[PDB]
Design a protein around this ligand. Structure first.
Ligand SMILES: *[C@@H]1O[C@H](CO)[C@@H](O[C@@H]2O[C@H](CO)[C@@H](O)[C@H](O)[C@H]2NC(C)=O)[C@H](O)[C@H]1NC(C)=O
Ligand SMILES: *[C@@H]1O[C@H](CO)[C@@H](O[C@@H]2O[C@H](CO)[C@@H](O)[C@H](O)[C@H]2NC(C)=O)[C@H](O)[C@H]1NC(C)=O
Ligand SMILES: *[C@@H]1O[C@H](CO)[C@@H](O[C@@H]2O[C@H](CO)[C@@H](O)[C@H](O)[C@H]2NC(C)=O)[C@H](O)[C@H]1NC(C)=O
Ligand SMILES: *[C@@H]1O[C@H](CO)[C@@H](O[C@@H]2O[C@H](CO)[C@@H](O)[C@H](O)[C@H]2NC(C)=O)[C@H](O)[C@H]1NC(C)=O
Ligand SMILES: *[C@@H]1O[C@H](CO)[C@@H](O[C@@H]2O[C@H](CO)[C@@H](O)[C@H](O)[C@H]2NC(C)=O)[C@H](O)[C@H]1NC(C)=O
Ligand SMILES: *[C@@H]1O[C@H](CO)[C@@H](O[C@@H]2O[C@H](CO)[C@@H](O)[C@H](O)[C@H]2NC(C)=O)[C@H](O)[C@H]1NC(C)=O
Ligand SMILES: *[C@@H]1O[C@H](CO)[C@@H](O[C@@H]2O[C@H](CO)[C@@H](O)[C@H](O)[C@H]2NC(C)=O)[C@H](O)[C@H]1NC(C)=O
Ligand SMILES: *[C@@H]1O[C@H](CO)[C@@H](O[C@@H]2O[C@H](CO)[C@@H](O)[C@H](O)[C@H]2NC(C)=O)[C@H](O)[C@H]1NC(C)=O
Ligand SMILES: *[C@@H]1O[C@H](CO)[C@@H](O[C@@H]2O[C@H](CO)[C@@H](O)[C@H](O)[C@H]2NC(C)=O)[C@H](O)[C@H]1NC(C)=O
Ligand SMILES: *[C@@H]1O[C@H](CO)[C@@H](O)[C@H](O)[C@H]1NC(C)=O
Ligand SMILES: *[C@@H]1O[C@H](CO)[C@@H](O)[C@H](O)[C@H]1NC(C)=O
Ligand SMILES: *[C@@H]1O[C@H](CO)[C@@H](O)[C@H](O)[C@H]1NC(C)=O
Ligand SMILES: *[C@@H]1O[C@H](CO)[C@@H](O)[C@H](O)[C@H]1NC(C)=O
Ligand SMILES: *[C@@H]1O[C@H](CO)[C@@H](O)[C@H](O)[C@H]1NC(C)=O
Ligand SMILES: *[C@@H]1O[C@H](CO)[C@@H](O)[C@H](O)[C@H]1NC(C)=O
Ligand SMILES: *[C@@H]1O[C@H](CO)[C@@H](O)[C@H](O)[C@H]1NC(C)=O
Ligand SMILES: *[C@@H]1O[C@H](CO)[C@@H](O)[C@H](O)[C@H]1NC(C)=O
Ligand SMILES: *[C@@H]1O[C@H](CO)[C@@H](O)[C@H](O)[C@H]1NC(C)=O
Ligand SMILES: *[C@@H]1O[C@H](CO)[C@@H](O)[C@H](O)[C@H]1NC(C)=O
Ligand SMILES: *[C@@H]1O[C@H](CO)[C@@H](O)[C@H](O)[C@H]1NC(C)=O
Ligand SMILES: *[C@@H]1O[C@H](CO)[C@@H](O)[C@H](O)[C@H]1NC(C)=O
Lengths: 171, 343, 343, 170, 343, 171
């Protein structure tokens, strides 16, 4: 919903194959596409943790009453049957809710992955680039597939095009 | 040049539900459910699993074991989980019983709901010296040992008047004491024998119907007998007989005495059942084949893969998947995006 | 210079579970649970709490009160919550009863499940004029008053044939009418007396076992008496007696008449119980000490601090914490971060 | 996860003591640390409201059946026991779920607190500062502890360094 | 100039709860609940709905139909949903019954819980040739037909000794076979007639109380009759009679034989009920008016608008709203903001 | 909470009538207000889908036991009554939870709608505008109601004020 309002591109790139989100370069070379492996691995890890959490739910067994005999205690066994059915129904609903929220969470974070990728791109591109606001940056230089690939790996240096760069704090 | 953040586009046949976007198409999912297939039953992994009450007792049925039929008395192992394979347990020998006239068939199913079941080593009542003149303990060729042609159920004593000039009697009362530990329930087996007019005269000195009443833990049961005109013998020893027995049980909680009021033809309790704990019981079938993580009433034995399962819900014990109404999926990809193109 | 946003780093010994990051270490938490400690029971804050049925009745037990024992008849206050302190309520006086031959012990436990319990002021049946010849209303020194050496339970009448040449009788039927309001259940107490052969002859004119049957709200119960050879007197007045009584109860819903069919030795109903509403009942130990927010079967009286609790789950009433399987915590700090350094 | 992708600092500052999140200054003075009290109070308040919401759940008591007597009605009392156990189990699960989602919310909101602190810092630093994108700004001026302290209180003025500022609407 | 993003300010009287902000005021909501109002009951949409067992049988009551009263025997349609309108079903004709002495009143309520109910076309027992001498099948003008002045319940046979010099009898036993399909339960109706001393002598050759015991599916019931001194006739044909009958029922699961042990006055089973499946049953009132999506015990018939409802929870069947403790709302606007002004 | 820390305006504009969120313009004309219809429709649609999801829950009916008769089986009918009550209580709680999380989501999404509107505004306003950080941009030109209206419709062009613009990729 965020990208829709912010004018982020609503389509996707079939070339982005080694991952789920990443970068595109435009201009005159045509179009290059690169998957960012950090963001993709992060998404996969969140989903994996979510899976562990959903797989961790443990519930009590439903078995027969030990004292209630067939024929002799049919009314009790009917109430017992009702209890089993209602437990199964209710826990089913609750599970459907946990999974629904999990999936809502998964689908919602996409645009946030984009926002983070924009911050990573912003720092790497340096202060000579211009921020458009729709997830796109205007550069003074050319960026063919080899440049985008250097962006995805975080090895990109604007110095290689004789442009100013931000340095990184030694931590 | 212009450089932008973007998201992939791939085939997206999988669907998941969301709260704010409805159903959405996605590139990949992790299925969370499966539908099990019907398999044979098995042992519960990490839990000894009971089938027949006394597995060492061959050719014997669970009812036979529960009544203490001759040749069919042996060890009944403890178990924390049990399979109910007979909703109407049948006998396969000994004296003809009119089963459907009481709740007796359900006796072995009651026993399996306990963890530990043992047959007492001492008799709960001295039958020879029991009220109503001295008795001889009746026997029959229908109930043979391996070292005898004749015998009778270990749980009961066929009390028949010993002396000549035997007569009709008023209703007499015996107390049945609790002879198990303070941690054990006692299951007391009792009943009555009846026959045709002449044999009734011979055996008991009365040819009229006899009356019987039991009282234990607030429950009273009353029975009146039948003289002749019995239904055909079934589930018995194969020997023709002119009479029939009716058999019942009383449950006595620890420290609770029960009573029986009886006339002629009484089958007095002897060895009683001592039972403690609880076993998790579900319906299933026999033989138990192999090990499994989970026992399920509609699918049999199964091992757990996915956390949930779809299909038919039923009682199930062990390390089991949780039933859900619908085949749920966890999204493991991105929402569908139409391919973007240049011109 | 360079200026940045940042998050603190501090000791982070606390752990909480998340959906997307698994378990994470945090600097602080708010515990949501406690494990309570075993304390004595108490009164429910905001709810009058019943212990003994009739607290004004001293040296008397709940069964004694329920049967209407002489000296033990007093006010039974209403209460919306009750403690069950006797799983097997005993008597402490009056005539020797063979308790375990019926469900009678549970009578006071049945009464406490109602909010209001009162003993009727009029008799439900005129015993002197009841079917089977005129009766004198038997009495005993085992049941002494404060202004008499002899008496009997207020709820029953020991109906003994008045005339000479008293004889055996066919089974007779009395209807027991509902004499409570349209808002009340009626609990009718009845029973029968027996003795040894000679005294049976003396009192009733028959030395044979007598038979009794009650029918109310679809439930039928049948009893046959015992002549001599009784088990030892217990839970009674301390006076030696040759006979025993068996006592039982019938529940009659409003507007439902019950019947009793009896012979000799009948203890006809007199004062009946009128009971309405419901009280929340849990197992407990007496005396009640102080007030508490919540009563718990395994922990006793307790006040509520945290919203949840861990430990042993059991029945519990009042403003109580909610049981959870695990000591949950609400994160109240940040996720762990390793200390950042310059070089 | 946001900071991990965006290259935000993954470490923390032990000096940040009066709060949970705030600011650091780098350059030549070395390193100054200041906790932002607004963000911290906001987080504390969210957690406190969350606590109230979790403490507001009310459930029915489990007590004995009033009509079912011991011994006489053991099968019923067994089913009753089963009912109590399944209720405790199910509600326990539902509560664990509510708390799980609560904690997920808090941990997830950390980076959002950082993003907000970046907007507050951006406005205060004025248009002469340069946005790096990893939560850091490059300034033309020095910022020792007293400056960072003035940033944390929102009293910071770029005018004091003869630098352009954004004004505030009346 | 300066350009900024902003959010509206409007009247915000609606309140909703949040997890992190507590209760917040909002500009708009979508109510998720309503409180229904008490309306008449109705038919279940998509489910044929049962009221009276045999709707074609006019002036007849459900108990009358269940007993097989003359003129009141017709088609009893299958239904998967049923309304319980009589908690205590009364009769409106035929022979005076002492209803409250058994569970008989509940018979039609038991039947309505099945999906399919049919009265057997053949008799389960040949009453004329039943044990205890040949019987004539008694009849009465209290039970008039449309083509006869006299008759009796189709479900029973008034077995009265045919020969002169009729006498008292020992308790005799009949087996009651299961004559329904393997998919059907059988509900067997039986009972006994009694009268005053003289008429008893005339009819049966004994003026003593007679005894009766039934046994089926582990349940035993015992009754002893009353001779004279009956309570006044009620719910009957309006004709004065000196005697009364007591009526009961036995439920026999498929393949289960039941027994009755009887003396004089036996009302032997003839036509039995064959019943299968289950109908969803709730309390309600008659007549059924119109259609509705959902039937609710406290509100009657209702259609579903909102997904949830507030008010009194009770049993309810069909396409129903889900009960909730509080009138929930889903936010459809923004949180309250005070109006912003320039100077 | 985001806006509170980021110094976003905590008040609202009564003039904003055709929607829930949008833009204000300041300076010398005084103050103009325009609702953004895209953001409003997005919010309404999210809420509507949320409504559908809450209305999709189906639970089993509670009716009488067919075999348990009044008077005869009162203890069983009591246990049955307890079962009905506990089911109603638990499912009620679970529904209250679903609704609580729904409402939490909506109120929480407000500031995200604002952030997205800032990205849309950033791109439309062009690279001559200055980003303040509190959701406000400083412009070189005048923007009266007709201009703000042009911003709301995404038809705004900085060229009309002889100012540089970001172009849009042909996609
Ligand atoms: C969205 O998901 C649905 C459900 O899988 C897809 O609909 C199916 O499309 C295929 C081929 O187009 C048909 O053969 C099926 O009959 C459709 N319905 C089903 C499977 O229920 C749909 O293609 C997906 N949309 C995409 C991938 O863009
Ligand atoms: C469930 O898992 C068990 C354990 O792996 C399976 O049984 C094992 O695998 C084969 C099958 O006979 C044997 O060689 C092993 O010795 C078995 N191990 C044990 C401990 O029994 C079993 O077949 C599985 N059942 C399923 C999948 O239904
Ligand atoms: C979720 O999906 C991802 C990819 O969409 C799965 O990761 C795969 O496993 C390989 C391991 O060699 C990784 O390198 C790639 O990311 C993926 N490649 C292939 C060919 O699948 C991940 O396993 C999925 N999670 C599951 C199934 O739980
Ligand atoms: C993270 O959490 C764990 C558990 O609270 C902490 O490890 C425990 O504390 C010390 C190790 O520092 C040991 O004495 C305990 O046995 C540890 N317990 C477990 C279960 O591991 C740990 O200190 C916490 N903090 C960090 C930074 O890891
Ligand atoms: C539960 O709380 C009550 C109320 O504070 C405690 O009882 C009170 O405190 C002291 C007891 O030492 C007395 O002086 C008060 O008069 C009491 N008030 C009453 C009884 O209304 C009680 O002790 C607490 N119970 C616990 C903690 O188990
Ligand atoms: C949650 O944690 C914070 C810790 O930062 C608690 O707030 C502390 O308590 C004092 C009150 O005197 C506050 O002024 C400070 O912000 C905190 N103290 C310190 C030393 O940082 C807060 O009370 C906690 N919430 C609880 C316990 O419910
Ligand atoms: C916040 O919500 C409350 C409750 O809807 C609004 O206050 C109500 O207004 C009525 C008007 O007569 C008064 O009874 C009280 O002022 C409130 N009612 C109750 C029961 O407290 C309040 O106006 C809302 N705040 C706004 C709109 O800013
Ligand atoms: C429930 O809905 C039904 C169907 O709309 C309503 O009955 C219909 O409306 C009128 C009667 O008011 C008739 O003209 C229609 O023919 C009825 N339809 C059917 C199928 O019978 C009914 O009144 C509603 N009940 C309520 C609102 O309580
Ligand atoms: C939620 O609120 C919106 C407006 O706040 C409602 O939609 C408006 O009213 C009707 C219904 O569609 C339309 O004619 C208007 O054009 C809508 N205004 C808009 C879209 O800005 C909407 O119906 C509400 N949702 C409900 C009541 O479920
Ligand atoms: C991109 O351009 C550089 C500069 O000419 C060149 O060295 C490199 O090989 C190019 N990459 C591709 C993929 O054409
Ligand atoms: C079981 O019974 C059959 C009957 O013929 C017999 O052949 C077999 O030996 C028996 N098994 C024993 C006695 O172990
Ligand atoms: C085998 O024979 C008889 C059977 O009546 C009995 O004593 C017992 O079952 C066996 N005999 C023993 C163990 O001495
Ligand atoms: C013999 O006579 C009758 C007939 O059976 C019998 O009841 C009685 O006990 C006997 N007499 C003696 C003295 O034992
Ligand atoms: C009655 O109570 C008093 C005072 O508690 C006591 O002294 C006496 O022994 C009691 N009588 C009994 C227990 O018989
Ligand atoms: C004592 O008992 C007699 C009868 O036994 C009774 O009439 C009298 O009212 C009793 N006094 C009491 C209970 O104070
Ligand atoms: C007196 O006693 C016997 C029978 O018990 C007999 O002489 C006579 O029938 C009796 N008379 C009565 C009971 O009036
Ligand atoms: C920071 O620098 C200013 C400018 O000289 C000075 O007045 C102030 O005392 C300094 N603060 C610290 C903590 O060094
Ligand atoms: C029902 O009774 C009424 C009056 O009592 C009568 O008009 C009607 O014909 C009767 N229907 C019958 C007997 O079927
Ligand atoms: C009327 O009752 C008689 C039984 O006395 C029966 O044979 C006849 O078929 C009945 N007629 C109708 C129309 O029900
Ligand atoms: C006739 O009556 C006498 C005395 O009541 C009885 O003993 C005899 O058995 C009867 N004969 C019959 C019923 O054939
Ligand atoms: C805004 O100013 C321009 C200046 O030419 C004018 O054309 C336009 O009509 C103005 N709009 C309003 C609402 O005054």
């Amino acid at each position: 919903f965020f990208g829709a309002i912010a004018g982020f591109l609503e389509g996707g790139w079939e070339g982005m194959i080694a991952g789920w989100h990443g970068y595109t370069s435009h201009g005159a070379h045509g179009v290059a596409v690169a998957a960012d492996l950090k963001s993709t691995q992060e998404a996969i890890n969140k989903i994996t943790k979510n899976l562990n959490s959903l797989s961790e739910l443990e519930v009590k067994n439903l078995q027969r009453l030990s004292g209630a005999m067939d024929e002799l205690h049919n009314e009790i066994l009917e109430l017992d049957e009702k209890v089993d059915d209602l437990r199964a129904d209710t826990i089913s609903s609750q599970i459907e809710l946990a999974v629904l929220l999990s999936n809502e969470g998964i689908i919602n974070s996409e645009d946030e992955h984009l926002l983070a990728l924009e911050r990573k791109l912003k720092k790497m591109l340096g202060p000579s680039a211009v921020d458009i606001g729709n997830g796109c940056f205007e550069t003074k230089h050319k960026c063919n597939q080899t440049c985008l690939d250097r962006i995805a790996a975080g090895t990109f240096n604007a110095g290689e095009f004789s442009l100013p760069t931000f340095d990184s704090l030694n931590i | 040049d212009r450089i932008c953040t973007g998201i992939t586009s791939s085939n997206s046949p999988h669907v998941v539900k969301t709260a704010t976007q409805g159903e959405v198409n996605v590139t990949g999912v992790i299925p969370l459910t499966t539908t099990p297939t019907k398999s044979h039953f098995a042992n519960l992994k990490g839990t000894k699993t009971r089938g027949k009450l006394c597995p060492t007792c061959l050719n014997c049925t669970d009812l036979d074991v529960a009544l203490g039929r001759p040749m069919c008395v042996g060890v009944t192992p403890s178990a924390k989980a049990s399979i109910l394979h007979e909703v109407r347990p049948v006998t396969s020998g000994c004296f003809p019983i009119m089963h459907d006239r009481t709740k007796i068939r359900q006796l072995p199913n009651l026993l399996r709901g306990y963890e530990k079941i043992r047959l007492s080593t001492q008799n709960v009542i001295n039958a020879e010296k029991a009220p109503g003149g001295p008795y001889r303990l009746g026997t029959s060729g229908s109930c043979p040992n391996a070292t005898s042609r004749s015998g009778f159920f270990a749980t009961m004593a066929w009390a028949v008047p010993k002396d000549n000039n035997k007569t009709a009697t008023n209703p007499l009362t015996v107390e049945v004491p609790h002879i198990c530990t303070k941690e054990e329930d006692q299951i007391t087996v009792w009943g009555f024998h009846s026959d045709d007019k002449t044999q009734m005269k011979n055996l008991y000195g009365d040819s009229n119907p006899q009356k019987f009443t039991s009282s234990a833990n607030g429950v009273t049961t009353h029975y009146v007998s039948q003289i002749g005109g019995f239904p055909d013998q079934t589930e018995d020893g194969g020997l023709p007989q002119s009479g029939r027995i009716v058999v019942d049980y009383m449950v006595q909680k620890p420290g609770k005495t029960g009573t029986i009021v009886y006339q002629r033809g009484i089958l007095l309790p002897q060895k009683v059942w001592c039972a403690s704990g609880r076993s998790k019981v579900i319906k299933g079938s026999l033989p138990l084949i192999g090990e499994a993580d989970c026992l399920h009433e509609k699918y049999g034995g199964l091992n757990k893969s996915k956390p949930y399962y779809t299909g038919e819900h039923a009682k199930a014990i062990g390390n089991c998947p949780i039933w859900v109404k619908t085949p749920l999926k966890l999204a493991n990809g991105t929402k569908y995006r139409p391919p973007a193109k240049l011109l």
